[PDB]
Design an enzyme around this catalytic site. Structure first.
Site, short mmCIF file in Angstrom:
data_model
loop_
_atom_site.label_atom_id
_atom_site.label_comp_id
_atom_site.label_asym_id
_atom_site.label_seq_id
_atom_site.Cartn_x
_atom_site.Cartn_y
_atom_site.Cartn_z
N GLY A 10 0.81 -1.21 0.00
CA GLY A 10 0.00 0.00 0.00
C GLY A 10 0.84 1.26 0.00
O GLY A 10 2.02 1.23 -0.39
N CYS A 11 0.24 2.38 0.41
CA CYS A 11 0.98 3.66 0.53
C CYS A 11 2.21 3.39 1.39
O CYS A 11 2.07 2.65 2.39
CB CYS A 11 0.10 4.70 1.24
SG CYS A 11 1.04 6.24 1.56
N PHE A 12 3.38 3.86 0.96
CA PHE A 12 4.61 3.50 1.65
C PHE A 12 4.99 4.33 2.88
O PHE A 12 5.96 3.99 3.56
CB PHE A 12 5.81 3.37 0.66
CG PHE A 12 5.96 4.53 -0.31
CD1 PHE A 12 5.54 5.82 0.02
CD2 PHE A 12 6.54 4.31 -1.55
CE1 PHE A 12 5.69 6.88 -0.89
CE2 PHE A 12 6.70 5.36 -2.46
CZ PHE A 12 6.28 6.64 -2.14
#
Length: 205
Positions: A10-12
């Site tokens: 997902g979003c890092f």
């Protein structure tokens, strides 16, 4: 020389802050991997996934421990085709591959649900834009500027262990007690230690 794990989940920003809080993780950087284009960027990603590169000391933490953390940060029980956010483990060698496959099997057995994480060979990892690195710390202006000066600039700061821990602290993944121990490791001159501590304390309030 350190060991390397590359994960996508997902979003890092969250993974950077989460993994950066863990003893044995020496440095982190976020970036893009899994696709088939050279030099991707945030708004020109092609088929790449938002990924984290974890540089870890295998004498302190194992690949298996990192995998356990990975599968505790998200629960990839859906099949999506959204490459940017897909759950992936990019293995660097056959040992990593077999460990990932085995743990995936055990999770599926223990909890009764198919896991959709792709376990695939790491091709190329491409570093993300500066503004994405140590995201929470970078946007905590006074602490960020103070640590940046101490470390000698942006690149040095984001590659450091202390920045990884500080970013984790800001995100709520590391206690101030644990953070102070990490600060001690860096052996700062006492004035700088006290200056950073006051910001950190004022952040905890």
């Amino acid at each position: 020389k350190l060991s390397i794990a590359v994960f996508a989940l997902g979003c890092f920003w969250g993974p950077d802050a989460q993994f950066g809080s863990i003893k044995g993780v020496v440095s982190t950087r976020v970036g893009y991997a899994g696709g088939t284009t050279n030099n991707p960027s945030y708004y020109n990603l092609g088929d790449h996934s938002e990924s984290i590169e974890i540089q870890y000391d295998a004498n302190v933490i194992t690949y298996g421990e990192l995998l356990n953390i990975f599968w505790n940060l998200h629960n990839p029980v859906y099949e999506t085709t959204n490459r940017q956010y897909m759950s992936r483990i990019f293995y660097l060698d056959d040992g990593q591959k077999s460990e990932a496959l085995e743990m995936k099997r055990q999770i599926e057995a223990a909890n009764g649900e198919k896991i959709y994480t792709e376990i695939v060979p790491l091709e190329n990892f491409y570093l993300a834009e500066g503004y994405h690195q140590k995201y929470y710390l970078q946007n905590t202006t006074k602490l960020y500027q103070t640590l940046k000066a101490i470390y000698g600039g942006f690149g040095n700061l984001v590659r450091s262990t202390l920045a990884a821990r500080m970013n984790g602290y800001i995100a709520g993944n590391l206690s101030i007690a644990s953070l102070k121990e990490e600060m001690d490791l860096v052996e700062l001159p006492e004035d700088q230690y006290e200056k950073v501590l006051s910001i950190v304390e004022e952040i905890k309030l």
